[PDB]
Design an enzyme around this catalytic site. Structure first.
Site, PDB file in Angstrom:
ATOM      1  N   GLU A 181       0.767  -1.270   0.000  1.00 14.44           N
ATOM      2  CA  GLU A 181       0.000   0.000   0.000  1.00 14.44           C
ATOM      3  C   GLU A 181       0.795   1.317   0.000  1.00 14.44           C
ATOM      4  O   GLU A 181       0.645   2.193   0.868  1.00 14.44           O
ATOM      5  CB  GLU A 181      -1.088  -0.017   1.064  1.00 14.44           C
ATOM      6  CG  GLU A 181      -1.788  -1.395   1.116  1.00 14.44           C
ATOM      7  CD  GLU A 181      -2.918  -1.471   2.096  1.00 14.44           C
ATOM      8  OE1 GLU A 181      -2.918  -0.639   3.030  1.00 14.44           O
ATOM      9  OE2 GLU A 181      -3.779  -2.362   1.932  1.00 14.44           O
TER      10      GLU A 181
HETATM   11  O1  LIG Z   1      -4.265  -5.398  16.524  1.00 15.80           O
HETATM   12  C1  LIG Z   1      -3.055  -6.051  16.894  1.00 15.80           C
HETATM   13  C2  LIG Z   1      -1.901  -5.732  15.950  1.00 15.80           C
HETATM   14  O2  LIG Z   1      -2.195  -4.918  14.802  1.00 15.80           O
HETATM   15  C3  LIG Z   1      -1.134  -4.979  13.865  1.00 15.80           C
HETATM   16  O3  LIG Z   1      -1.484  -4.246  12.699  1.00 15.80           O
HETATM   17  C4  LIG Z   1      -2.429  -4.822  11.883  1.00 15.80           C
HETATM   18  C5  LIG Z   1      -3.736  -4.025  11.915  1.00 15.80           C
HETATM   19  O4  LIG Z   1      -4.410  -4.509  13.074  1.00 15.80           O
HETATM   20  C6  LIG Z   1      -4.581  -4.455  10.724  1.00 15.80           C
HETATM   21  O5  LIG Z   1      -5.767  -3.663  10.648  1.00 15.80           O
HETATM   22  C7  LIG Z   1      -3.791  -4.291   9.410  1.00 15.80           C
HETATM   23  O6  LIG Z   1      -4.619  -4.757   8.309  1.00 15.80           O
HETATM   24  C8  LIG Z   1      -4.496  -4.067   7.064  1.00 15.80           C
HETATM   25  C9  LIG Z   1      -3.446  -4.775   6.209  1.00 15.80           C
HETATM   26  O7  LIG Z   1      -2.141  -4.844   6.845  1.00 15.80           O
HETATM   27  C10 LIG Z   1      -3.323  -4.167   4.783  1.00 15.80           C
HETATM   28  N1  LIG Z   1      -4.702  -3.977   4.280  1.00 15.80           N
HETATM   29  O8  LIG Z   1      -5.652  -3.368   5.110  1.00 15.80           O
HETATM   30  C11 LIG Z   1      -5.897  -4.006   6.371  1.00 15.80           C
HETATM   31  C12 LIG Z   1      -6.925  -3.160   7.126  1.00 15.80           C
HETATM   32  O9  LIG Z   1      -6.351  -1.837   7.307  1.00 15.80           O
HETATM   33  O10 LIG Z   1      -2.663  -5.182   9.483  1.00 15.80           O
HETATM   34  C13 LIG Z   1      -1.735  -4.847  10.524  1.00 15.80           C
HETATM   35  C14 LIG Z   1      -0.610  -5.866  10.516  1.00 15.80           C
HETATM   36  O11 LIG Z   1      -0.020  -5.726   9.218  1.00 15.80           O
HETATM   37  C15 LIG Z   1       0.002  -4.203  14.487  1.00 15.80           C
HETATM   38  O12 LIG Z   1       1.115  -4.180  13.582  1.00 15.80           O
HETATM   39  C16 LIG Z   1       0.370  -4.835  15.850  1.00 15.80           C
HETATM   40  O13 LIG Z   1       1.315  -4.045  16.551  1.00 15.80           O
HETATM   41  C17 LIG Z   1      -0.851  -4.974  16.744  1.00 15.80           C
HETATM   42  O14 LIG Z   1      -0.464  -5.812  17.827  1.00 15.80           O
HETATM   43 CL   LIG Z   2      -1.792   2.017  -1.968  1.00 14.18          CL
END
Ligand SMILES: OC[C@H]1O[C@@H](O[C@H]2[C@H](O)[C@@H](O)[C@H](O[C@H]3[C@H](O)CNO[C@@H]3CO)O[C@@H]2CO)[C@H](O)[C@@H](O)[C@@H]1O
Ligand SMILES: [Cl-]
Ligand SMILES: [Ca+2]
Length: 510
Positions: A181
């Protein structure tokens, strides 16, 4: 009670189903019989292969930490081994027999440490960040220098090839993605890349990283641009330099395909193998976006219709995309059309998507439609994304309906065939054979909350079908259960009833 007719033709619209449409980001229960696996998402942008550290960006207080090691089941000693998040992931792929897609860093920096939150005053360059360099231009070290200010990406690819062989080998890592992204870098990863990414910028970074990858493994597939959603497809989320580069192009998609073609021509090798997007539906029902929460009856109905936005010219979902940009929907033909014009022959992947309702029959049904849709619309690879933690029972059911319907990893066939229905609102149906005509597979579902229908099948093709077995899941059982056989078929016609909120996989035999 309603009657619908379904006409299946084994002669008509025959086409290979890429098995890598049965893919995922996070492993689900472990009995879905996936064919492809991806290591990608927000966390991979700043992942540093030398020490396995990474950064959460806006998801968790810009914390640099060992989340990938811990989430990946690694001990501390393993977290200390260069490459371990990735080799542990790829080891899993080999055990499962899957394709591995491995994101590589392109936003500019990766986590130098695991000490936690990185403040706005520590944004890169800072002691918190190591600089990414595509081509080392020096002899490679299998144990990288942990003491300098650099992470070399081509050195990491050489580490993978040394440990596993090249991508054309049985054990090699086959795909690499150009970060994740990038039109959200300045939003998701401001400590790495605070300015809004430019269109040209994105192209120059893609070309340079693709070149250093391919110089190590000319067999690896390179996936890009890994766009988050429509605003990025349209204008790379208002890129600053858009109005100046856009010229004839109808959206950023054409601009990236074309410029990727041009640079490939100048280099004299294909630098973009797969056109890569994410798709989280903006579709609404009862006030609720389908990806946010399960919702009410209207949410659940809208979840079950949304997959029509992928393919159906007649369908107008309730969302801002369909309101202001309907000319770009349905979205798979539209992306196909851009590929055909600007970079013929480029593969198409949906590397992170979800329809929500993870533990609701509406999500299982949505997904069972989507899998049939991707298969017959020339998608090369698709990878589910968990928006909810814990189990995702009905998503898991959907895969198992196509890939492990009987507990013996029996699957849908590898060859899509024409399958039509008289009611596209209440039903969807997807047909397949194998390239062994003996078996015809039909996944059929009823999207109605209320009414069974009887499905009157008529089959045309080479063969006559005697009987079949049926398997399914519904609102009361997410586990697939064997259902009533079709003990006799007269003249390639038979009727089977489909209760509300039910999905079946029928296997007819000769
Ligand atoms: O909630 C616990 C952990 O979250 C981790 O990040 C994640 C986000 O929660 C999650 O929404 C995100 O999803 C994205 C995706 O990566 C790309 N496309 O869109 C989705 C919705 O926005 O993914 C993240 C992980 O890559 C975080 O890194 C941790 O520190 C937290 O414990
Ligand atoms: Cl993008
Ligand atoms: Ca280093």
């Amino acid at each position: 009670a309603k009657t619908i007719t379904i006409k299946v033709d084994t002669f008509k619209d025959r086409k290979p189903i890429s098995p890598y449409i049965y893919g995922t980001n996070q492993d689900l229960a472990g009995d879905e019989n996936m064919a492809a696996r991806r290591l990608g998402g927000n966390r991979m942008t700043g992942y540093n292969w030398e020490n396995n550290m990474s950064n959460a960006g806006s998801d968790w207080q810009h914390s640099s930490d060992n989340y990938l090691c811990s989430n990946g089941g690694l001990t501390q000693a393993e977290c200390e081994k260069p490459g371990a998040v990735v080799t542990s992931f790829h080891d899993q792929s080999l055990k499962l027999g899957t394709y591995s897609l491995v994101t590589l860093p392109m936003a500019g920096y990766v986590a130098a440490d695991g000490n936690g939150s990185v403040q706005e005053s520590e944004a890169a360059p800072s002691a918190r960040w190591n600089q990414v360099v595509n081509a080392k231009n020096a002899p490679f070290q299998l144990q990288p220098d942990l003491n300098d200010n650099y992470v070399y990406v081509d050195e990491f690819v050489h580490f993978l090839v040394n440990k596993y062989g090249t991508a054309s080998t049985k054990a090699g890592v086959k795909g690499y993605a150009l970060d994740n992204e990038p039109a959200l870098w300045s939003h998701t990863h401001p400590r790495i890349h605070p300015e809004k990414v430019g269109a040209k910028e994105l192209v120059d970074r893609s070309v340079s990283l693709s070149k250093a990858v391919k110089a190590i493994d000319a067999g690896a597939e390179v996936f890009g641009p890994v766009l988050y959603g429509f605003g990025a497809y349209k204008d790379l989320q208002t890129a600053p330099d858009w109005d100046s580069v856009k010229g004839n192009y109808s959206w950023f998609v054409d601009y990236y395909l074309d410029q990727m073609r041009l640079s490939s021509q100048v280099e004299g090798k294909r630098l973009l193998d797969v056109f890569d997007v994410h798709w989280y539906p903006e579709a609404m029902g009862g006030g609720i976006r389908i990806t946010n929460e399960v919702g009410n009856d209207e949410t659940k109905k809208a979840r079950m219709q949304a997959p029509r936005t992928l393919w159906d010219p007649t369908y107008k979902e309730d969302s801002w995309i369909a309101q202001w940009f309907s000319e770009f929907l349905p979205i798979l033909p539209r992306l196909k059309q851009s590929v055909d014009k600007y970079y013929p022959g480029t593969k198409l992947a949906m590397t992170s998507y979800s329809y929500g309702g993870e533990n609701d029959i509406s999500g299982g049904i949505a997904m069972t439609d989507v899998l049939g849709i991707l298969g017959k619309n020339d998608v090369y690879m698709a990878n589910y994304w968990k928006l909810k933690d814990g189990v995702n029972n009905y998503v898991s059911a959907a895969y198992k309906l196509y890939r492990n319907y009987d507990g013996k990893n029996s699957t849908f066939g590898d060859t899509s065939v024409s399958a039509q229905t008289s009611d596209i609102v209440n039903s969807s149906v997807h047909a397949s054979v194998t390239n062994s005509d003996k078996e015809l597979h039909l996944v059929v579902m009823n999207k109605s909350m209320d009414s069974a229908f009887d499905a009157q099948f008529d089959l045309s093709g080479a063969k006559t079908y005697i009987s079949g077995k049926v398997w399914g899941f519904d609102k009361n059982s997410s586990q697939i259960k064997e259902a009533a056989p079709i003990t006799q078929i007269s003249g390639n016609r038979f009727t089977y009833t489909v209760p509300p909120l039910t999905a079946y996989h029928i296997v007819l035999t000769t």
